[PDB]
Design a protein around this ligand. Structure first.
Ligand SMILES: CC(C)Nc1nc2ccc(C(=O)Nc3cnn(C)c3)cc2[nH]1
Lengths: 39, 156
């Protein structure tokens, strides 16, 4: 049995940790909702 | 039970101890999460029951108590925030500029942040705090890191 617990408010926080890159990737989505790399 | 707007953890007592399988968003009385988290199964909120209302395995999304309410979109230009809710750790906002997932049916925004599978369902936000999508359905790239799509549903 699955259950839910509150974890916080949904807000934009100024001066948050800024990380992560922005890659342009060619992908395919299958009938089961799975993404795969197309190269 | 708890119907307050906000981000929630999705847990189970079926495995060892209490295990976090995913995250979801409560908005306008509707609970929104990714399909692979709940597999469409019913949820418990305190002493109340949340029954599924809509779902699609291809979109990897599911809504409880009502129809999908999240309708904001990434504008293709601005940086966004992943309000990550990791297992056993506090809610943490992480800002990044999304990349792209090019598909035969159109481009989709994508966040290059890597978090455990238990983080799936955590919302991605725009400057006004509106939910533009959910994190957790993506791909494993060359260097072994995970890159997730910004997954958004349709509001009728
Ligand atoms: C690369 C590794 C170090 N990290 C990593 N973060 C993940 C987040 C989600 C999933 C995941 O399995 N999603 C999914 C979406 N749909 N389905 C069926 C399954 C995997 C992950 N791996």
């Amino acid at each position: 049995d699955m259950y839910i617990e509150r974890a916080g408010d949904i807000t934009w926080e100024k001066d948050a940790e800024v990380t992560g890159n922005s890659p342009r990737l060619d992908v395919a989505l299958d009938e089961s909702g799975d993404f795969s790399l197309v190269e | 039970g708890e119907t307050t707007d906000g981000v929630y953890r999705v847990m189970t007592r079926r495995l060892l101890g209490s295990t976090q399988v995913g995250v979801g968003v409560m908005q306008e009385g509707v609970f929104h999460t990714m399909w692979h988290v709940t597999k469409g199964a019913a949820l418990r909120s305190g002493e109340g029951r949340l029954d599924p209302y809509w779902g699609d395995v291809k979109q990897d999304l599911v809504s409880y108590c009502g129809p999908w309410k999240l309708d904001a979109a990434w504008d293709g230009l601005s940086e966004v925030q992943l309000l990550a809710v990791p297992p056993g750790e506090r809610a943490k906002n992480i800002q990044t500029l999304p990349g792209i997932f090019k598909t035969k049916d159109g481009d989709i925004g994508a966040v290059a942040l890597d978090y455990p599978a238990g983080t799936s369902g955590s919302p991605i936000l725009d400057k006004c705090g509106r939910v533009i999508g959910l994190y957790g359905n993506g791909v494993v790239i060359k260097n072994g890191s995970y890159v997730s799509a910004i997954t958004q549903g349709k509001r009728e």
